[PDB]
């Protein structure tokens, strides 16, 4: 049987379960594991983001040492739109307005002069004793201050604890953000995790009644088996089998392992995309589909350049 595009467009549908900021559960119905895993792998490792690459330290008197603090700072998500920037070329130590961002972190811990009152907590004894992510100040280079409104280029989370100081200690450094894909380094990955699972279909091969219905309700996840008193006696039925986690606990009950059938619905996926905050997750899934279209267009242009 050939590839019928019309049959695919009849049987394919997307059902959105829940979408807030930084999470998205949806369904893909009637697509194969090859393409669904392609989308999952693009979301993991090939949708580009902006992340700190070079850290120019000037003074670092903290105990969080320098090459550790650089890696520390590279793992912070930078809330930029990566589609407005470009790849820095091979060998450019100095990036321009097109392809880099700058952040200055300059925090000095001093002792709180007044209002200490011989206490013990560090929040009263010291000032700037914890270096958070709100201390990172964006340094616009070129015309980036006019291109981006104020408060747009920033880290995603302010209150990620970078380091921790004591009086006298100082962190003075400058960060350069570049664009890359998560195949290169995991700091560029835009998702917390992106994954899928096929939808389970639990069916009852035999009517289950009485205390066996309560055992059946407890051998599954809370919610899939609705045990209900129709006559006063209890019968069990499957109600929303999406909740089941395949603990397969019903296969340990010797009597009731013959009345159910756990399988999966073929080609019915449940994706979950959890953005770190760089882009909204529906935008991440759109860009992840466009990446695979770009791969196909890349090799079609290679074939047309050979011909």
């Amino acid at each position: 049987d050939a590839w019928d595009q019309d049959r695919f467009e009849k049987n394919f549908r997307v059902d959105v379960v829940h979408m807030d900021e930084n999470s998205l559960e949806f369904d893909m119905v009637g697509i194969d594991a090859a393409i669904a895993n392609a989308f999952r792998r693009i979301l993991l490792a090939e949708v580009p983001t902006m992340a700190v690459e070079k850290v120019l330290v000037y003074n670092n008197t903290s105990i969080v040492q320098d090459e550790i603090l650089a890696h520390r700072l590279g793992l912070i998500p930078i809330h930029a739109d990566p589609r407005l920037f470009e790849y820095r070329n091979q060998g450019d130590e100095e990036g321009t307005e097109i392809d880099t961002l700058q952040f200055r972190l300059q925090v000095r811990c001093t002792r709180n002069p007044h209002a200490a009152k011989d206490s013990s907590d560090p929040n009263e004894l010291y000032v700037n004793h914890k270096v958070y992510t709100r201390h990172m100040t964006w340094i616009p280079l070129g015309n980036q201050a006019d291109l981006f409104p104020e408060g747009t280029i920033r880290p995603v989370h302010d209150d990620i604890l970078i380091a921790q100081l004591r009086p006298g200690q100082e962190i003075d450094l400058l960060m350069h953000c570049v664009k890359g894909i998560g195949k290169d380094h995991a700091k560029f990955s835009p998702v917390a995790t992106a994954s899928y699972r096929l939808l389970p279909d639990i069916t009852l091969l035999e009517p289950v009644e009485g205390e066996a219905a309560e055992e059946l309700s407890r051998c599954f996840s809370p919610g899939v088996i609705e045990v209900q008193e129709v006559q006063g006696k209890k019968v069990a039925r499957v109600a929303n089998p999406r909740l089941d986690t395949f603990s397969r606990e019903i296969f340990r009950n010797e009597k009731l392992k013959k009345v159910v059938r756990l399988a999966r619905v073929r080609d019915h996926y449940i994706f979950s995309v959890e953005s770190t905050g760089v882009l909204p997750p529906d935008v991440l899934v759109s860009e992840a589909i466009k990446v695979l279209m770009g791969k196909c267009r890349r090799f079609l242009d290679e074939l047309d350049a050979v011909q």
Partner: protein
């Protein structure tokens, strides 16, 4: 097998701190007993690579062949420089300077401590 993305996040990252105790009396025994760490001012072998006491900066990195320390002879004037002969790039951690037991010792014992990164690579044992 280790996940690449876990290794690229902070999984099992490390360091090793090598401390090299440098004594100009014990090793550099040429005579005259008047060697002190320092540079001859205007030396093109140590420019912006050792500090004015002939001793590397504390933030500094050390590749192979970089100047490691410089010491000058006080009764002569000639300054020597010693180069970093290890093949691993390290970052200077601290430099402590030592006297003798009386506080009368001269600027000739030092103890450089360097950090070598050593994150988990292919071939490391868990």
């Amino acid at each position: 097998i280790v996940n690449k993305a876990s290794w690229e996040r902070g999984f099992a990252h490390g360091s090793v701190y090598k401390s090299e105790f440098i004594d100009l009396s014990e090793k550099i025994k040429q005579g005259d007993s008047s060697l002190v760490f320092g540079i001859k001012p205007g030396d093109p072998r140590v420019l912006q690579k050792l500090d004015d006491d002939g001793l590397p900066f504390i933030g500094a990195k050390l590749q192979y062949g970089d100047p490691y320390y410089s010491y000058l002879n006080l009764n002569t004037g000639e300054s020597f420089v010693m180069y970093y002969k290890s093949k691993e790039n390290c970052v200077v951690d601290n430099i402590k300077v030592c006297s003798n037991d009386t506080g009368s010792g001269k600027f000739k014992c030092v103890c450089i401590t360097m950090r070598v990164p050593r994150n988990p690579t292919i071939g490391d044992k868990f």
